[PDB]
C-alpha cells in the first residue's frame, strides 16, 4: 500500500543492507534477542548463547541473520507483489517455527533500529516512514496468510 516514491526510499536504504547483509542480519538478531529475550526460545540452536559476546561470536547466528535478511530483501524488491515470496515464509513460520505475528513486530522494530544506528544520515524521516510501511505491509500479509492457513493473525 506504498506509493512508488515510498518504494524507492525503501529500496534505496535496502541498498545499504545489500552492501553487508550478514553484518546487518547479525545486528538485527542480537537486537531482537536482547530486546525481547523470549524470542530466543524459538531457536533450539541458540539456547546456549548467554550473552551479547556469545551472540557476536556465533557463526550460526550470523548465518541465520544473513538468511533472514536475504529473504526479506527478496520480498521487499517485489514491492507488494510478493505473494510467491511471502507464501513459503508464512507456511514455514506458521507451522514449523511457530512464530507469532507479535514476534514479527519485534523483528520489524529491530530492523528499523539497526538501520537507524548504522545509517543515521541516510535513514531520515521519509525513509523511516516508508520502511515502517513496507514492514507493516509484510506483517499484515503474513498475518492474513496465517489466518487462511488456520492460525492466529
Ligand atoms: C523479517 C522477518 C523474518 C524473515 C524474513 C525470516 C526468514 C526466515 C528464513 C528465510 C528462514 C529459513 C527458511 C524457512 O525455514 O522458512 C527462517 C528460519 C527460521 N526462522 Fe524466520 N524469518 C523472520 C522472522 C523470524 C522471527 C521473528 C523468528 C523468531 C522469533 C524466526 C524464527 C525462525 C526459526 C526458528 C527458523 C529456523 C531456524 C533453524 O534452522 O534452526 N524468524 N526464517
From Swiss-Prot:
It is found in: Cytoplasm, Sarcoplasm. Nitrite binds at residue 64. The modification Phosphoserine is found at residue 3. GO terms for molecular function: heme binding; metal ion binding; nitrite reductase activity; oxygen binding; oxygen carrier activity; peroxidase activity. Residues 1-147 form the Globin domain. Its EC number is 1.7.-.-, 1.11.1.-. SUPFAM superfamilies: Globin-like. One of its GO terms (cellular component) is sarcoplasm. Keywords: Cytoplasm, Heme, Iron, Metal-binding, Muscle protein, Oxidoreductase, Oxygen transport, Phosphoprotein, Transport. InterPro entries: Globin, Globin-like_sf, Myoglobin. Heme b binds at residue 93. O2 binds at residue 64. It comes from the Eukaryota. One of its GO terms (biological process) is removal of superoxide radicals. It catalyses: Fe(III)-heme b-[protein] + nitric oxide + H2O = Fe(II)-heme b-[protein] + nitrite + 2 H(+); H2O2 + AH2 = A + 2 H2O. Belongs to the globin family. Monomeric heme protein which primary function is to store oxygen and facilitate its diffusion within muscle tissues. Reversibly binds oxygen through a pentacoordinated heme iron and enables its timely and efficient release as needed during periods of heightened demand. Depending on the oxidative conditions of tissues and cells, and in addition to its ability to bind oxygen, it also has a nitrite reductase activity whereby it regulates the production of bioactive nitric oxide. This is Myoglobin. The gene is MB.
Amino acid at each position: 500500500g506504498l506509493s512508488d516514491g515510498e518504494w524507492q526510499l525503501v529500496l534505496n536504504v535496502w541498498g545499504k543492507v545489500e552492501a553487508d547483509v550478514a553484518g546487518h542480519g547479525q545486528e538485527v538478531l542480537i537486537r531482537l534477542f536482547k530486546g525481547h529475550p523470549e524470542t530466543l526460545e524459538k531457536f533450539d540452536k541458540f539456547k546456549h548463547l548467554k550473552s551479547e559476546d556469545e551472540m557476536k561470536a556465533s557463526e550460526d547466528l550470523k548465518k541465520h541473520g544473513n538468511t533472514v535478511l536475504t529473504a526479506l530483501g527478496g520480498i521487499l524488491k517485489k514491492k507488494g507483489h510478493h505473494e510467491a515470496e511471502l507464501t513459503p515464509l508464512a507456511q514455514s513460520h506458521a507451522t514449523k517455527h511457530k512464530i507469532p505475528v507479535k514476534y514479527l513486530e519485534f523483528i520489524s522494530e529491530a530492523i528499523i533500529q539497526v538501520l537507524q544506528s548504522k545509517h543515521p544520515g541516510d535513514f531520515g524521516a521519509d525513509a523511516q516512514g516508508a520502511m515502517s510501511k513496507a514492514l507493516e505491509l509484510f506483517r499484515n500479509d503474513m498475518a492474513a496468510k496465517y489466518k487462511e492457513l488456520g492460525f492466529q493473525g
